[PDB]
Amino acid sequence: NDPLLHVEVSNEDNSLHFILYNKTNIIIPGNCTFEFSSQISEVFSIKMGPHEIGIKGQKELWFFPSLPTPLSNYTMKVVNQDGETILVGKCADSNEITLKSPL
Numbered sequence: 001n002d003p004l005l006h007v008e009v010s011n012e013d014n015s016l017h018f019i020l021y022n023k024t025n026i027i028i029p030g031n032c033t034f035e036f037s038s039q040i041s042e043v044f045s046i047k048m049g050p051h052e053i054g055i056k057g058q059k060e061l062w063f064f065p066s067l068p069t070p071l072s073n074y075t076m077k078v079v080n081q082d083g084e085t086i087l088v089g090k091c092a093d094s095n096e097i098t099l100k101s102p103l
Contacts, residue, residue, distance in 0.1 A: 001025050005078070005087060005099035011069040018061040020078075022053040024099075031081035037074050038067045045079070070095050 003024050010017030022028045030052045035045045046061050053059050074091040078099060087099035 003087060003099060003101050005089065005097065007076075007089065007097035007099075009069050009071060009095035009097075011066060011095075014066070016061075016063040016066040018063070020053075020059045020061065022055060022057055022059070024055075027055060028053040028057075028059070029081055032086070033079045033081075033083055034061045034076070035079060036063075036067070036071060036076035038071070041067060043075065045083070071097075 001023070006021040006023050008019040010019070018034075030048075031050045032048045033045045034048060035043055037043045044063070046063060048059065048061065070093060071091050072093040075088070076091050076097065077085050077088045080086045085102050088102050089097040089099050091097055
């Protein structure tokens, strides 16, 4: 139901704290990897857990040190276990993000 990918930007605790929830129809395959851009820092991919998430299940992407928010106009995409961009966050003018789709 919609590829939209609910997300939440914390940006606190002296660090970052992302929370994504697979709302899409299909269920994450697992072993995915994130990748967000920025200005102060560069782009970086975080190794996600191998275990899936779930239509409801969530996911965390703790990063250090941290980045400025919100992340509007950013990339913050999502790849698969093959490091292939599976989805892409619109990264709107809000801590909220809902992956749309590449192709």
